């Protein structure tokens, strides 16, 4: 599994692969690991599938719950804190093999500079959190390959599109060196999923664009 | 026995009769909630779930308690099963049960009146649903409009003569504010929201300030 | 003591007398439930278990509480033992016990009247059972028909001089709506359901809309 | 309290008087239970334990609660010790205690009257035992018959003269229905009849229903 | 221990040996392991003596309890379910050495065909159950010898008497190959206990008949 | 029932009328709290959270209980979520709920009247918010000023005629003490505090002694 | 054990073997592992027999319970969620050997088109779930053999009868390579159980049909 | 420890040795291990001394408790059930070293035949129980030897006296082969304790009787 997130001028992007494994066996090819949790926030999760999906769903439900009760969404720090508390709450089961790490990407509408409103927060198994100032972050079994790739490719990010291509390429390198992360399946037409968030909100990146970007990467590597 | 119940019912009826009025009526785009509310941050209309809205009249802390309890019920059920299993009929039923218990067992009955409204999901053609729950847990499902709080009869008649099915948003608004008058408003005295059947997921949306003034000029 | 129970009983009886009426009568195909019900979505008649149905008159939230309690009891008993051990006599008995306790100990008694009906299992040959439980836990076992809610005497009389055993579905329905009139009664003001002894498992089946309109004319 | 307990006793007594009557009498083969009961399936007479039966008059849900509690007590005592340690005197005693507590402390007293009957075990020579428990926990040990519910005086008088402790089943039944008729103003459709049959090997309780009961009635 | 049960035309039979052991030492010769739990049901139990006997007693009391409370006995499916719940309830103590497996034989009065109204239900330690639609079943340390014997002798079962013979012979083979199962003690006159169930109910077979069958088997083997 | 609630409302109302008066009004620098207080250490105005202040009139132990409960609620919210999620609307709402429960269910209703005020965070342009919560849980959203305790009418009218939306601290204080009079109250009978929108984090600060004496002259 | 489920045009099919084992010993030949949980859903379960049957029973009771209480059956997503929560609830006992994995096959009446309205959901021991978009799925000790057989045979599925064939054949391959899965017993006449679900509901396939199909498979592999 | 009980025509006898040990060390010479629990029943207990005495005392209290509460003594089956429930209740502490097994001898006043109304019931650590028809039974560290002796000597039991002698002799053999069982101490005059139960109730056998029988046995084995 690999989830990537990077900031571009005025927005943020998050992408994730589609592969589910049980040990060495492939048990999933169309899996979705990146979710839109609220109008301006998206979460990608790595680890035990059951716990991961429960995290994403329950987290979105919690945010919208606070929004409807108090008439205003949580501050971004509040969202961070609740996700962290959820992870810390799962620590016990994580020690027993039901581990799940989230990666949070958002656009803070209360931020000072509408271009520096992008937010990327990483977590550890104890619910430690980090707001990333260096522009990108990844989680999962291929996160070190994806981060080391983005370390070289990030200078190419100049708008909401170059960022998507650097994300997809980082996922490509992750799948290139990590068998638990799935790369582009041109035979079946299955590509990573992506969500992009700017001042207009959080939207799903259409599949066709990720397909064309992936093909560009592949033919570039041939 | 009969004297305590007479007193509870009487207290609740008087308390509701003293409060401002609320109207909810079905129109071509969904359901419209209009309530006399001079405040600028205290709410009488709220979102319950994706396609389910909530309106109340009476003592604020009480119908706000009920509002939060309904949100809790809806979110908990949607989590336990699925978001499509949460319905307006369910919320109305649970509000009837709860207000029955309050009316019968709490130290003082709730001086509140409730409306639960549901519009169709995006792309589905389903008639809106209006539910009315009273201070004692009595529930009725109206097809066109619900009026709550204050002196309801003149407003109910005003709507009875002036209501038309599948009206435009502006038309329904004008008719609603007109019926409210008979019992001069504007943006500073109104709280208006709508269950918008044309929105993909969350149908509830508020109409405030400049937009509301635009709809009021007509 | 005497006046507290007097007052509770009177509150309940007035509450039931003020509500719409429901009739359930046994016919050749099982049991027929007909109730004055203007609502689109609120129900006074419901399924309890495979061959056991439920009808109620009075305050909605209260007899709905009792309905859910009955479904819970039935499902739990079927799980603990087997679906065939759940009987109409059991649900009627538990409703008698429960309504007795509610009437005696609850803050306000329940303004409800209940009917639990049972038809035979598929292929089995067994005369239907009709049970009537009142607000104080009193239970009675009726052989032909049950009337609850509102002013019953004219409806009960209408049935007494117009009911026949093993009537057709249309005949039984027409007799039922006729007896209801004595106290427009088209499809828009009726809620009709049937325990159909001819179904393999779940006998409860609603008759709504165009089908009911067809059965009325 | 001078009037609260008076009101309770009156509520219970009136409740029992307004209900149909039940008779239990000892006959040559054991004990006979006859109760005016229009229901096809709602029972006023029941088995308690191997040789112990139960009859009740009054409000159904209440004496049914007491019936279920008695079955619970009997089965529990038989499990904890042995089936031979469960006696009618025991069930009568626990019923006296229970109805006392209910009468003094429950929200509303129970409008019930109870009879616990015991016949001898198979092969043992021992006269039947009849116990009468009233709404306030009062317990009495009757030697020949017990009448409960409704206006008991005509039934008790009818039984008191022209009674045979060694009557046949049919004879004892017809005397019983006669005494029930003296408290009227019946047949298979208006009666619930059961027997504690001292000649049965283990469970002495059995019901007499339908055509067989008609046989005992019509001759 | 060995408990056998087999169906015959219009009825069912269940038989059990009489031996109680502690390790290798024989601690009982007249022990009874088959009980009439209901007018139409019999139960044989193998394992820890205390748990087995308490199972039989508590189960019979439970059935009669429901019968007196609700005025009608449980359906056979209900009886199966209650026995299963009892075993599953004991699983915890069974793991610590208080193990008891039951075998249920009954006659279903509600069955459509009175000739095939016999029922035989076997259980596992987790309360799993099986209604045998094959004619015979056994439980205990010698149950495999008994099942393999009945596999060959079952074609001879045409009435109650032939079924009882086949049952006692299966117990004979079990005792022949399992030292924990007791055979007929001709010196003491102690023979297996048997219960037969038909439309007239469940009755214990008198010891004289079983002894006759035992001597027939022995002479047949010499 | 009705009698009991009437008696409760009267007890609380009389209690509030017999108590000292408090005023809270929005001025150019934030929110101003002025209260008649002869004590030296018993406080009627207090800090709730970063930008949220609290003022009360009535029986001390009771509105002090509510003050502590509000502090607990605010701190708990700020910890569970974030300091920026604690708002004046929330504290006012929870105070309405709490006083509703107290008014209906406590042995004796609380003879208190509450004001929750909120100013904007440092560097933000948000008009102050004033909330008024009364002994029965009624909550109101005032736009300019709130007066509590004693005979309020003359003070409310005085402020209605003399209020200036963007007055200076000295001006607003003079107006508040003026309306409070309508013995000769001064820097020994007053408790004054301010929610100063120009503080970086904690906006609540008291104006006492020499500084306050300077403000009156 | 092997449970298979596959989508066919306008419906779904589920089949399961009949073998019950304790270690190497065969303790059952007529066991049923596929149950009709509601009018439009069937569940097949693998693992500890007691836990499996209790899962099926309690699950059916849960669905019908919601239906009677709220007057409408659960959305299909709701059914999935409840089954998943049940498995997740059993995880603890599963760690001690009382493991049970379900496979869900249903017909979603609320689908946008009765073509592809069939649904197949698989689960893991932590109650992870997956709605299969590739047409088939299997569970149990022979699930890999059956899935690999269906990987080759799925292209032949055009209606209910061809799908039933491919299902029974996948079970045949599973039993061919896994001793814990039982094949057709032609001597005793015991064959896998199957349920087929379309817009008209869920029905049990009669033993006759499955037998004919089994002999077709045998004779195809023989002569 | 050795407790013996045997049936004789019209009654039952129970006897026990007097030795208390802690490992190899003798910590008691006059210990009494057989108790009269009620007018018609006696229990002898082996194992941990504390638990044994607590069993006897608590059991007598329970029986007399029921008798005074319900005005009639328990049936013999009831007494057995209560003792068994007590042992099963102690199972937990028994697993930790506080084990005590009882042996019960009684006279059933409700029995059909008074000559065979004697009852001897043995228990195991889980409170399993067996009503012995073999005629005799023993419990304790020497119970094998005593039972094997009674297997040879039982045919000589014709009345209460011959039964008593056979009991004391079985205890003598038990002490002969088991160092945890104490034999007759002719220097100190300490002999086994015995209780005999008939239709007239349960009585303690005097020390002169048991002493005479013991000296007869010793002289018979000494020539
Ligand atoms: C690193 O670990 C690999 C992990 N794989 C797993 O967790 C796989 C996934 C799988 O076989 N299925 C998905 C659910 C339906 C059946 C098929 N189960 C397991 O590993 C079983 C866990 C377990 C074993 C024993 C006792 C308790 C628990 C994975 O892919 N994680 C990535 C992932 C992230 C967010 C959402 C997801 C949703 C579905 C699948 C994967 C998802
Ligand atoms: C587990 O397979 C061996 C088992 N043996 C046992 O259960 C023997 C039986 C025995 O020694 N006695 C019977 C009662 C009176 C004294 C003599 N106890 C034991 O093995 C001791 C159990 C234990 C010890 C310590 C901690 C926990 C548990 C057996 O024979 N089971 C067969 C059996 C089945 C149904 C009913 C029965 C009733 C009585 C005896 C046996 C019965
Ligand atoms: C591969 O997994 C082995 C499993 N085996 C078992 O479950 C067998 C089944 C069995 O012996 N019987 C069926 C019911 C009673 C009569 C005989 N028990 C066992 O293996 C004992 C479990 C145990 C756990 C913890 C402590 C002690 C013991 C199995 O075959 N499972 C297959 C299966 C799936 C769905 C429904 C079923 C229903 C009945 C039988 C089997 C079923
Ligand atoms: C286990 O087989 C040996 C047993 N010995 C014991 O029970 C001796 C008794 C003993 O030393 N004394 C009696 C009391 C006054 C001092 C002397 N305790 C012990 O051996 C230690 C107990 C223990 C060990 C570890 C943890 C907790 C506890 C025994 O003799 N049992 C025979 C016996 C049976 C009925 C009633 C009795 C009463 C007194 C003494 C013995 C009795």
Tab-separated table of C-alpha atoms in Angstrom, chain D residues 73 91-104 133 136-137:
chain	number	residue	atom	x	y	z
D	73	UNK	CA	-39.909	-22.378	42.446
D	91	UNK	CA	-45.784	-24.371	47.245
D	92	UNK	CA	-48.642	-23.215	49.462
D	93	UNK	CA	-46.131	-21.641	51.863
D	94	UNK	CA	-44.212	-19.769	49.158
D	95	UNK	CA	-47.528	-18.611	47.684
D	96	UNK	CA	-48.569	-17.274	51.103
D	97	UNK	CA	-45.282	-15.383	51.463
D	98	UNK	CA	-45.417	-14.064	47.897
D	99	UNK	CA	-49.031	-12.891	48.010
D	100	UNK	CA	-48.360	-11.258	51.376
D	101	UNK	CA	-45.458	-9.244	49.975
D	102	UNK	CA	-47.464	-8.342	46.855
D	103	UNK	CA	-50.472	-7.282	48.938
D	104	UNK	CA	-48.425	-5.004	51.192
D	133	UNK	CA	-54.238	-18.955	49.429
D	136	UNK	CA	-53.420	-11.126	51.262
D	137	UNK	CA	-51.290	-14.233	51.800
